[PDB]
Design a protein around this ligand. Sequence first.
Ligand SMILES: [Mg+2]
Ligand SMILES: [Mg+2]
Lengths: 299, 299
Amino acid sequence: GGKMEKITCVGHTALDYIFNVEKFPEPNTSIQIPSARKYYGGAAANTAVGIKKLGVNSELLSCVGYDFKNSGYERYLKNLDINISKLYYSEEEETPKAWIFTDKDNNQITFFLWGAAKHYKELNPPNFNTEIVHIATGDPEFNLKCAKKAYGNNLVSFDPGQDLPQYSKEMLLEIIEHTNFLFMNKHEFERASNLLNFEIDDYLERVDALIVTKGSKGSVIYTKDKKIEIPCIKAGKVIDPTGAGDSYRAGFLSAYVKGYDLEKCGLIGAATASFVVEAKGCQTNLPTWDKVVERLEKH
Amino acid sequence: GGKMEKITCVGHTALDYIFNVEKFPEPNTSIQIPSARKYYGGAAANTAVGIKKLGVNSELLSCVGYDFKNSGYERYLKNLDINISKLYYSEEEETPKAWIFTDKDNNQITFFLWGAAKHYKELNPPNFNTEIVHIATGDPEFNLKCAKKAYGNNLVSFDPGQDLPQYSKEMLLEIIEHTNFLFMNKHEFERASNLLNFEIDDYLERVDALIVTKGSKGSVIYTKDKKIEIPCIKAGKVIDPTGAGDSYRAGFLSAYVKGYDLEKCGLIGAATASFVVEAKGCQTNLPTWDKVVERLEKH
Ligand SMILES: [Mg+2]
Ligand SMILES: [Mg+2]
């Protein structure tokens, strides 16, 4: 049939570390970083936490490591009442991590430790009883299994994100054919469209809504019937843009479950993203529902 | 007076992590690393462990973090009978770490998390009762305090290493004036000599032995009386060159304490270095004394 008032987020739960260096080192040189704070991250977790903060029950499906057990992150999620019953805990691998070296002018070079994500290929998705299954970056093969199992039962939301290069023409077409809400940033949309030889109408033969996000230039929602332009919502002061995308999706999907029309979903996504960019870390300044509604009332 | 049959190593104790990536990422891209093994490291610790493996009692003076306590590294050092009574344990900071991203052609870009090394400026050196105080990379101000306190009591060994750029003409002259054995790699020697306007004889007015290491082209020992050429000792197969320098110093200083002439000290240093380069990690393939003597017997 169809399922309950909740959203499942599938994909990375990770610890993000931002290392403030002066200059990237040339061969046979040692530069340093004073300290490196850890932030709770991972696209799936970011989205799940944002959804929960907006008053919608979320559940998380990720592979975590031996250093997740009893650690800051686990207690943090338990304290937020996020259902983590579906987490796979690895005995051998550590939790996925992103080690981000950033310079003095603010140019970022990153890295992603796969770690316990190696386990996705050993696993198969459970049945989902949620209204929406949102598939964020993770293991593409497992993500396709999730889309193909959920589609026609749960609404499927998908954003290929930085995983996009790993999808062949054929595999991308397959997951999109099992997607209800397809989110892509503009660069990724152009790349996907060139790969698929798709125009907008080709996506809309397969999905219910295509949402192209353009950051500071807003977003656009395309359906069969309509093109909806969503403005960017002005933040107070941009400290960290990293969590913005996941937070827009968190807001959009939360609004959808809460029963608003797609335009309002877009506006809530935009308003949500405007909060997260005000602080460092993808989950640090996630807003409540009433705070997001209040900000849209001003803008 | 003078002191006992032991060597104090001052400076970094660190955890080294080598991350095997495909290509360094361009702006707004996510590449990955499958896993990242941890190796026991830090120039001071590397040297102390190498010394101990050669049958000479060593002690370590480093600032370590809250994640050192009870961790792999602490038990490992205790099990090797390395005196770690002088370690400073930080409550607030983590242990220094080196995060080394390496590519497919084998080009390395590195980073050094300062962490608990912030505490050196809060501390002052104890009296040392050892025959040699070896001062490796660390906090230059604390290192100078160590040299100035030890000189004329303990023999002082010093290598500015990758810290060399942090020393002004004046500060470098000062620590060298309190050094008995000065080690430098050739590039660092040329840089130091240009900065100081020193020729070899200028060093020798201040130090007892200047040891210039040239890796695969061997090393040279200069004293007032003599120039001693030390060949490189052929290894089996070079897997990791990272630990080679510290191991040469470990061998050289161990031989010195064991009462051999400087030429033999050089040869032992060379032979020791030939073992460490055969495996990944700076301490993983550290040889015993008899094994080092045996290898020189062949070469
Ligand atoms: Mg269809
Ligand atoms: Mg003098």
